[PDB]
């Protein structure tokens, strides 16, 4: 009769990137489905998402990256401290690039292109010569990667990490781009950003040297043919507190099923980007994605219902 989460309240944890909101309250509602009662969720830190998800004081996130969390997960306790289970989003990509017209100019195929300081001051936005890398908000991965590969490849007197807030400097850098000036920055997918700059038309990434990414040493970032981008195809995943997911079985299995792709949060994160991006917006998205993919959303629905619970 009741459904297993009655009179329990569940805390999501994202970061402040709203284009976070999305795939966490899809998470939401199939919890709903379940019948947990789920608070909206809480926007912080990622470092403090992680330590509170281990102690238990957050649920779980829809947002731990592969492999840009790997080095905070472990860190905040790993397996022994976390439940995860399956893959939520396939298929994410990251890496660095640059505008299409300077690439075809000046025949730059390669980061490593910028250990030129020639190179490098097409760049250059604030005048000391060095190119100006539009990077990552203190305390994100890619913050951490960014600094580790800048150092691999001997960049760091050449290239600036420029951080702050990313979305506000990635305005600033599409402004600059459209100004016709060369321009020089990290992104990720899904996001909004190569929406605007497309890889092939406006944009094109940049491979690297070699692979390097902190704190494994025997990364491989190589693809087949040897090209390298200087990161994996990457993933995110659904983390909880792994006591709570012993304790509650149809959430557990909930969380190990359920698989957003890319391209839908690519395709949210462009029509937030375009003007609707308000919580009721968002909630809207949600509820539409599913509509549009019930018979799956219900399938995880049933399978989760239908656990030892």
């Known amino acids: 009769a009741d459904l297993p989460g009655k009179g329990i309240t569940v805390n999501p944890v994202q970061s402040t990137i709203t284009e976070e909101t999305f795939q966490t309250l899809l998470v939401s509602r199939a919890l709903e489905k379940l ?46 401290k976390f439940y995860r289970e399956g893959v939520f989003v396939n298929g994410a990509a990251q890496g660095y690039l640059i505008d299409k017209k300077t690439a075809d100019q000046y025949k730059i195929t390669n980061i490593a292109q910028l250990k030129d300081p020639k190179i490098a001051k097409l760049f250059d936005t604030n005048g000391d010569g060095k190119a100006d890398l539009t990077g990552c908000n203190p305390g994100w991965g890619c913050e951490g990667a960014i600094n580790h590969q800048l150092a691999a490849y001997e960049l760091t007197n050449t290239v600036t990490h420029n951080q702050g807030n990313y979305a506000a400097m990635m305005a600033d850098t599409i402004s600059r781009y459209k100004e016709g000036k060369p321009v020089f920055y990290y992104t990720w997918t899904p996001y909004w950003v190569s929406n605007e700059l497309k890889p092939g038309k ?6 690297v040297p070699f692979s390097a990414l902190p704190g494994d040493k025997n990364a491989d970032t190589k693809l087949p043919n040897g090209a390298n981008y200087g990161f994996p195809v990457s993933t995110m995943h659904i983390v909880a507190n792994k006591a709570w997911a012993e304790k509650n079985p149809a959430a557990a299995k909930l969380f190990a099923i359920m698989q957003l792709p890319v391209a839908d949060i690519n395709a949210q994160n462009a029509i937030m980007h375009d003007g609707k991006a308000s919580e009721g917006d968002i909630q809207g998205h949600v509820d539409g994605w599913i509509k549009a993919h019930q018979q799956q959303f219900d399938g995880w629905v049933n399978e989760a219902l239908a656990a030892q619970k």
């Open 35 to 80: 019948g947990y009662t789920v608070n909206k969720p809480s926007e912080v830190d990622y470092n403090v998402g992680y330590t509170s998800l281990a102690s238990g004081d957050a649920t779980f996130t829809a947002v731990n990256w592969t492999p840009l969390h790997d080095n905070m997960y472990e860190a905040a306790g790993g397996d022994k």
């Open 202 to 207: 406006d944009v094109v990434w940049l491979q």
